[PDB]
Subunit: 1011 residues, 2 copies
C-alpha cells in the first residue's frame, strides 16, 4: 500500500486535533504559564539518513540506525544540509502533473532518535507524541513497530505510544517523504523544502483526560457586560465525582469562576452529551482586546474531584473581542476596522522554514514599529507560538488553510472533484479546531488561489457553522463567489480595469459599486513590493481612507525568501531561484518583501510606514488639525514636535503634547512663525514622538510625520560683475575654456563635455552625455525571460525600439564668447535603424564667476515607448566619503513613491546611497533635489539624482549583488525627469499614466560650480 | 537687460519680476535670439510662487497694429477649447474669419482660446512652437471692466495673447472652485519656446 499516492488516506491512527496542550498538574503553574514537566521537548540531536527512494531504505534501519548515517539537529530541513537541492517555483509544479501519483524517484529522509522514558509515565495514563510539522508525508515506527502515517505538513500530527513505549531505551524511526498526494495541495509560492521543520514533543496525560475546550465570548451593544461560554470535553471513564472549574484571572486577581458537574443540556430527542459540560462566566466591565490595547485574560480549566483533588489543569489566553459584519462593514467591538496588514512567510534567515521565538518577536517588533496592525498567515497554518505572540503584542491574524492548487489545468480541477474533499476537509477542520481559541485570529481563510469548487464553499460555511464568531474569506473564483464574506482580490488596482475572461479583476472602487454587491472589500494581496517597487501606495491608502467599505489590505509580502550560498572563499551571499541547480524556477520571484532576509528594512518600508499612520494632519492657515485613526485608545503616549526650516536651516521648533480621542479631532495653534527676508523656502515639519517605551517600541519612537510648504521668498538679487572673463580657444577638434585654475574641454567630434580640470586634476573619466535609459527594474522586466519574450513589458518595448542601442549623432556644435561668458551650443539626435527617437539641444553657459549653466531641451517621439529617464550621465574621477544633498530624503524615493521622504539637508555616507537589492537595478534615486554636493563639486537646480560606485550598464548585466564590483571613480546620473516605478503587480505594466514620461518636450536647467 | 551680437545672431537677455506690496509673485527670464534667416526665437522661463494663488495663465501679451480678415492656425479646433475641455477639438489646419475667433458671451470673459497650437498665421506674421492662443479685437482689460457684450467696442489693431500654459476652467458648479488640481498651474517653474517669423 502506497499511502502517499492515495488521496483517500490522509492519516492512520492519528489523534484528533485540539487547542494546544501542556498537561499541568497544578493550577498555579497553569495560571502563569510555567513550563510543565509532563511536556517534554524532543528537539535536539537526531540521526539522519538520506535515500533516493523509499524502496531503497533497508529494513535493518527499523532495528538500529545505519553506521553511515549522519547526525543533524531537529527541527531542520535536510535541503540546507546538502542532501538535496531546494526547488522554488511560483506556479508550475516541481514534479510531473499526474495526480495523485508522485514520481518514483522520491527523496526520502530517515530520522532516528534514541531516548529514555520515566517509568512513572508508563504505569498510568496515556503518552502521546506531537509532530508540529513534517514536510510532507511520514511513516512512524516505535521500537521497530509501525505506529501510524501522516500527510499534512503545517498542522500537528499526534500519535499514541502508550502500548508501544517500553521502560529504558526507546527508539523512534521516522521515514519522511518529499512528495506525496497531499503535495498537490501545497503549490504555495515558497522554496519547496522538506524535512521535520517544526518541533517534536512528548506529552503525558492521565487516564481520564480533558479532550478539548472551546472558549467563546458574548457581549451586548455597549460592551459593558460579557458572558464567557466554555465548552469542555473529556476522554476516558465517566464518573459522578469529576468536576470542572473554569477560572478567569486578570494578572493575579480572579475575575470570575464556575463549577459544574459533567453533563450537558438536552440537544436532541433522547438526551445530550454526558461527557461535555458548559460553564457560563459573567464578567462585569471587561477589558476589550484589540491591536492597540492587547488586553488579555488567563482562563484556567481544571478537571478535579468533588473533594478538590486536581487531576489535570489546562490554560489558555482569552481576549474579549467580537468580529462581525453588518451593513457591509467589518466591525471589531462595534468599530469599523482599517486593516494595515502584510503577508508573511515563515522564512528563517539561516534555517529556511525552521521558525524560532527570537525571529518571531523581531518580526512583530519591526511590523508594529512600521504601523502594521494585521498579519495574514499565508498560505498555511503557522507555528502555534506565533498566535500566542500575536495575542501578547496585539496583531490581527488571518488564519489560512494550507491549500493551493495553482498547478492544475484548470484551477478548480481538484477542488471541484469530490474525491479530494476528505483531504481538504482534514486540512481545514483540524486547523479550525486548533486555532479557534486565539483572539488574534479574527478571519478564517480556506487557502489561496485554488479556483472555485463546491468543496471550497462547503468548507467555508462549515467554518461558519462551527465558528460563527469569526468571518471567513476566500479568494479563488474571482473573489466574488459565495465562498467569502469579504471581497478579497489579488492586486486589484485602484482605478484601472483589467477584465480577464471569467475571472475579472475590477478596480476596487468600481467593484464595490457592482449591482447586488454588499460585502466589504479587504485586499488579501496588493502592492507587490518586489525589489524596487511599491509605487502608488499613496493612491491605495487614499482610496482606503476615503471609502468606508474599503477596509485596507495586506501587502505581499513581509520578508524576501532568499537562501544563503557560499563562494569559493566562503563569503556568504543571498541566492534566488535557479542558483541550486533546480529546473524549472521563477528566477528571483521569491524576493517580494519589505525587508531583507536578515530583516534589514527596504526603502519601501518607510513609505509603507508613512501611508499607514494612525494620525492625520491638515494645515489650515497657522493651525494644525490632528486626526486620530485609533479606534479604542486615547492619545496618552504621544506628543507633537513641530519645526520650521528655511532651506534646511532650522529657525523655530517646539513640543506640544497630544490629547486626541479615538477617531477624534484636535486643534494645535502654532506660535508666531518667523518671517525671513532671505531667499528660500519655508517647510513646516511635524512629528509624533512617543516619550515612553512600550512593549514594541523604544523611548523616542516616531509614529507619524507630515510636512508642508509655507510662504516663500523668491530670489531677485543679481550676481556681482566678475572681473575675469573666460578665455575661449578654438582648436581643429576641441573647444577649451580657461578661467585660470578652472578649465573646461568640449569634444567637437562627440559634441559633449570632454573633460574638466581643477589645477592639474582631471574630474571625469567618461564625457558628460545624455541618458534616456535606466537599469530595468523587477516590475519593469515582468515575467519575460530570454527564452520567452513578453512584448507588454517595458524593457522589451525599449530594447525592441532600440532605447538601449541608440547611438548619439552630432547635429550642431557651435561656440562663441560673450561679454561676461562663453556660450556653448550643441544639438544631438538618437537614431535606431533610421528612426530618430530623442533630440536634445543643450546650451552651456560658462560664467566668469565660475558657475557653468546647463539648459537641456529634449524632444521625445511618442510612437516609441515612453523613456524611463530624461537626464545626464557622467562618471566623476573622485571618490568622496560623504555626499551632501538638500531635498527629499534621506531614504530612496521615486516619482510615484515620495510621500515619505522629507525635504531637508541630509548628510550620508556614499555606501548608504546604494541600497543592496539582490537583483541589481535602478536604485538610490532621490527626488526633489535642489542642491547636491559631492567632493569639490556642487550642482543646483531641480533634478532627480542617484550616485553610486556602479555603472548602469553593470547593473543591467550583473544578476547577483555579490558579483557587482566597484568601478573606478564615481558614477552620477542627474535626471531632470524620471518615470515612476509602479508596483501594483510584477507581471503587467503597473506604471500609471501620470507618472509616465509622455509629454513630448522636456526642459530642465542645471548649475555646475565648485564650492 | 543685456544685449550681445553672436556669430550668426543677436542675443537679447532680459529678466523681470512682478512684485505686489513687497512680495515677489512671478519671475520671468527671457532669451530673444534674432537669427540671420529672419526667424526670432523667444525662450521664456517663469518662476511662480506657490503661497500666492496659482496663476490662470503663463504667457505673452501684445497688440498687433494690423487687422487681418483671415487667421490661419494649425492645431486643435476649429471651436474654442481649454485644457480641461479639449477632447472635442480636432488637430488639423483651420482657416476662420477673425469675427468667428471671438465667441459672443453675454458676460465678457476669457474666450476664444485654442489649445495644442503648433503654428499660427495672422497677416504677415507667423508663430511656431507649442502654445495656447486666443485672438480678438478686444483687450483683456476691457473684458474685465465691461459687463455687457453690446457695450464692448473694437479697439485699434488686434489683441493677441499667446500662452505657454493655461489653467483649466472648471465647470462642476458656479459657486465653488471647480478647477481640478491637475489643471491648475502649480508646478512652480515653467518653460516654453516661441519662434516669430514673417511668412
Amino acid at each position: 500500500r502506497r499511502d502517499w499516492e492515495n488521496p483517500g488516506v490522509t492519516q492512520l491512527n492519528r489523534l484528533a486535533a485540539h487547542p494546544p496542550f501542556a498537561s499541568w498538574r497544578n493550577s498555579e503553574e497553569a495560571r502563569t504559564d510555567r513550563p510543565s514537566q509532563q511536556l517534554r521537548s524532543l528537539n535536539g540531536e537526531w540521526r539522519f539518513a538520506w535515500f533516493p527512494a523509499p524502496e531503497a531504505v533497508p529494513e535493518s534501519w527499523l532495528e538500529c540506525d545505519l553506521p553511515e548515517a549522519d547526525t543533524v539537529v531537529v527541527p531542520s530541513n535536510w535541503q540546507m544540509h546538502g542532501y538535496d537541492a531546494p526547488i522554488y517555483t511560483n506556479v508550475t509544479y516541481p514534479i510531473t502533473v499526474n495526480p495523485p501519483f508522485v514520481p518514483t524517484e522520491n527523496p526520502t529522509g530517515c530520522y532516528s532518535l534514541t531516548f529514555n522514558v520515566d517509568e512513572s509515565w508508563l504505569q498510568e495514563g496515556q503518552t502521546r507524541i506531537i509532530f508540529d510539522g513534517v514536510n510532507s508525508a511520514f511513516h512512524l515506527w516505535c521500537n521497530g513497530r509501525w505506529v501510524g502515517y501522516g500527510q499534512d505538513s503545517r498542522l500537528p500530527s499526534e500519535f499514541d505510544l502508550s502500548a508501544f513505549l517500553r521502560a529504558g531505551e526507546n527508539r523512534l524511526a521516522v521515514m519522511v517523504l518529499r512528495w506525496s498526494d497531499g503535495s498537490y495541495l501545497e503549490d504555495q509560492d515558497m522554496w519547496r523544502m522538506s524535512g521535520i521543520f517544526r518541533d517534536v514533543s512528548l506529552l503525558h496525560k492521565p487516564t481520564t483526560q480533558i479532550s478539548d475546550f472551546h472558549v467563546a465570548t458574548r457581549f451586548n451593544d455597549d460592551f459593558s457586560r460579557a458572558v464567557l461560554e466554555a465548552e469542555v470535553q473529556m476522554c476516558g471513564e465517566l464518573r459522578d465525582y469529576l468536576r470542572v472549574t473554569v477560572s478567569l484571572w486578570q494578572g493575579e486577581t480572579q475575575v470570575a469562576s464556575g463549577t459544574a458537574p459533567f453533563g450537558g443540556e438536552i440537544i436532541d430527542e433522547r438526551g445530550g452529551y454526558a461527557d461535555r459540560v458548559t460553564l457560563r462566566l459573567n464578567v462585569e466591565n471587561p477589558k476589550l482586546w484589540s491591536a492597540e490595547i492587547p488586553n488579555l485574560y488567563r482562563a484556567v480549566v481544571e478537571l478535579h474531584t468533588a473533594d478538590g483533588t486536581l487531576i489535570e489543569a489546562e490554560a489558555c489566553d482569552v481576549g474579549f473581542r467580537e468580529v462581525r459584519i453588518e451593513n457591509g462593514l467589518l466591525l471589531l467591538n462595534g468599530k469599523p476596522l482599517l486593516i494595515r496588514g502584510v503577508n508573511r512567510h515563515e522564512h528563517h534567515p539561516l534555517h529556511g522554514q525552521v521558525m524560532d521565538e527570537q525571529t518571531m518577536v523581531q518580526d512583530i517588533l519591526l511590523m508594529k514599529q512600521n504601523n502594521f496592525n494585521a498579519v495574514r498567515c499565508s498560505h498555511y497554518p503557522n507555528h502555534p507560538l506565533w498566535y500566542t505572540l500575536c495575542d501578547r503584542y496585539g496583531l490581527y491574524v488571518v488564519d489560512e488553510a494550507n491549500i493551493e492548487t495553482h498547478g492544475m489545468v484548470p484551477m478548480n480541477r481538484l477542488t471541484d472533484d469530490p474525491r479530494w474533499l476528505p483531504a481538504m476537509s482534514e486540512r481545514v477542520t483540524r486547523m479550525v479546531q486548533r486555532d479557534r481559541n486565539h483572539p488574534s485570529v479574527i478571519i478564517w481563510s480556506l487557502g489561496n488561489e485554488s479556483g472555485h469548487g463546491a468543496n471550497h464553499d462547503a468548507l467555508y460555511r462549515w467554518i461558519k457553522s462551527v465558528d460563527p464568531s469569526r468571518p471567513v474569506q476566500y479568494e479563488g473564483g474571482g473573489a466574488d463567489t459565495t465562498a467569502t464574506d469579504i471581497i478579497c482580490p489579488m492586486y486589484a488596482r485602484v482605478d484601472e480595469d483589467q477584465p480577464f475572461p471569467a475571472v475579472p479583476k475590477w478596480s476596487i472602487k468600481k467593484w464595490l459599486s457592482l449591482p447586488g454587491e454588499t460585502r466589504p472589500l479587504i485586499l488579501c494581496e496588493y502592492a507587490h513590493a518586489m525589489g524596487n517597487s511599491l509605487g502608488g501606495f499613496a493612491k491605495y491608502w487614499q482610496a482606503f481612507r476615503q471609502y468606508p467599505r474599503l477596509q485596507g489590505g495586506f501587502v505581499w509580502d513581509w520578508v524576501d525568501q532568499s537562501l544563503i550560498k557560499y563562494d569559493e572563499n566562503g563569503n556568504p551571499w543571498s541566492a534566488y531561484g535557479g542558483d541550486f541547480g533546480d529546473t524549472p524556477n521563477d528566477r528571483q520571484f521569491c524576493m517580494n518583501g519589505l525587508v531583507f532576509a536578515d530583516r534589514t528594512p527596504h526603502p519601501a518600508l518607510t513609505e509603507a510606514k508613512h501611508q499607514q499612520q494612525f494620525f492625520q494632519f491638515r494645515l489650515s492657515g497657522q493651525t494644525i488639525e490632528v486626526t486620530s485613526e485609533y479606534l479604542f485608545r486615547h492619545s496618552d503616549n504621544e506628543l507633537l514636535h513641530w519645526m520650521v526650516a528655511l532651506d534646511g536651516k532650522p529657525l523655530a521648533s517646539g513640543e506640544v503634547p497630544l490629547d486626541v480621542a479615538p477617531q477624534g479631532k484636535q486643534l494645535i495653534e502654532l506660535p508666531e512663525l518667523p518671517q525671513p527676508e532671505s531667499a528660500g523656502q519655508l517647510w513646516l515639519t511635524v512629528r509624533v514622538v512617543q516619550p515612553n517605551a512600550t512593549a514594541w517600541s523604544e523611548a523616542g519612537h516616531i509614529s507619524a510625520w507630515q510636512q508642508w510648504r509655507l510662504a516663500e521668498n523668491l530670489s531677485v538679487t543679481l550676481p556681482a560683475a566678475s572681473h575675469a572673463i573666460p578665455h575661449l580657444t578654438t582648436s581643429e577638434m576641441d573647444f577649451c575654456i580657461e578661467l585660470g585654475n578652472k578649465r573646461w574641454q568640449f569634444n567637437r567630434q562627440s559634441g559633449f563635455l570632454s573633460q574638466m580640470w581643477i589645477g592639474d586634476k582631471k574630474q571625469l573619466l567618461t564625457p558628460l552625455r545624455d541618458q534616456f535609459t535606466r537599469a530595468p527594474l523587477d516590475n519593469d522586466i515582468g515575467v519575460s525571460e530570454a527564452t520567452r519574450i513578453d512584448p507588454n513589458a517595458w524593457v522589451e518595448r525599449w530594447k525592441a525600439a532600440g532605447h538601449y542601442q541608440a547611438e548619439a549623432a552630432l547635429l550642431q556644435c557651435t561656440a562663441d564668447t560673450l561679454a561676461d561668458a562663453v556660450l556653448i551650443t550643441t544639438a544631438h539626435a538618437w537614431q535606431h535603424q533610421g528612426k530618430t527617437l530623442f533630440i536634445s539641444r543643450k546650451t552651456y553657459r560658462i560664467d566668469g564667476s565660475g558657475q557653468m549653466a546647463i539648459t537641456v531641451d529634449v524632444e521625445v517621439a511618442s510612437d516609441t515607448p515612453h523613456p524611463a529617464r530624461i537626464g545626464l550621465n557622467c562618471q566623476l574621477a573622485q571618490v568622496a566619503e560623504r555626499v551632501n544633498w538638500l531635498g527629499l530624503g534621506p531614504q530612496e524615493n521615486y516619482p510615484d513613491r515620495l510621500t515619505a521622504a522629507c525635504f531637508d539637508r541630509w548628510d550620508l555616507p556614499l555606501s548608504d546611497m546604494y541600497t543592496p537589492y539582490v537583483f541589481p537595478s535602478e536604485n538610490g534615486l532621490r527626488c526633489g533635489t535642489r542642491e547636491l554636493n559631492y567632493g569639490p563639486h556642487q550642482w543646483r537646480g531641480d533634478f532627480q539624482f542617484n550616485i553610486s560606485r556602479y555603472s548602469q550598464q553593470q547593473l543591467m548585466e550583473t544578476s547577483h549583488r555579490h558579483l557587482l564590483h566597484a568601478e573606478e571613480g564615481t558614477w552620477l546620473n542627474i535626471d531632470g525627469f524620471h518615470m515612476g516605478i509602479g508596483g501594483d503587480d510584477s507581471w503587467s505594466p503597473s506604471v500609471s499614466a501620470e507618472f509616465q514620461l509622455s509629454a513630448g518636450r522636456y526642459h530642465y536647467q542645471l548649475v555646475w560650480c565648485q564650492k
